[PDB]
Design a protein around this ligand. Structure first.
Ligand SMILES: OC[C@H]1O[C@@H](O[C@H]2[C@H](O)[C@@H](O)[C@@H](O)O[C@@H]2CO)[C@H](O)[C@@H](O)[C@H]1O
Length: 147
């Protein structure tokens, strides 16, 4: 039931999500971390506005020094950071990210292994845009919708 919408998108990638993120929806992102990476992010956004900057419902931000920082941007202001230190990401290694949308939270597994949970701060129904930024190569972006 997984239907990819784009292959090898140029980064920064900003795209419209074709259907609503209802409970049970999956977002599947397949990529690869470059040799010189410092960090990258997957942002689930409300709109693609740049001025003013669009709210980010779910900021999923792997940093390579390593860790994953998650947060929410509302009215151009960042909320409280939720930091995961048990990170599966490494440089020169490929990955598969699966984001599960649940009623009350997102659930993320990388490479088949569970990674983290993140409670909704903005109602997921307000998400219509997917943004991927920073140092990362993306092989594919797909959705399995539950509408
Ligand atoms: O919370 C995610 C955002 O972090 C911002 O930087 C933080 C940094 O992570 C934290 O340790 C402390 O320095 O506060 C900073 C506020 O800017 C990034 O600038 C932003 O891109 C998000 O990743």
């Amino acid at each position: 039931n997984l239907q990819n919408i784009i292959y090898n998108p140029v980064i920064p990638y900003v795209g419209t999500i074709p259907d609503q993120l209802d409970p049970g929806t999956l977002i599947v992102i397949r990529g690869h971390v470059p040799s010189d990476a410092d960090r990258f992010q997957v942002d689930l956004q409300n709109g693609s506005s740049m001025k003013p900057r669009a709210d980010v419902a779910f900021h999923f931000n792997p940093r390579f020094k390593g860790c994953i920082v998650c947060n929410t941007l509302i009215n151009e202001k960042w909320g409280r950071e939720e930091i995961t230190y048990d990170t599966p990401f490494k440089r020169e290694k490929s990955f598969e990210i699966v984001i599960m949308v649940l009623k009350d939270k997102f659930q993320v597994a990388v490479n088949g292994k569970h990674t983290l949970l993140y409670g909704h701060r903005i109602g997921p129904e307000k998400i219509d845009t997917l943004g991927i930024y920073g140092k990362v190569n993306i092989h594919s972006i797909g959705f399995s919708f539950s509408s």
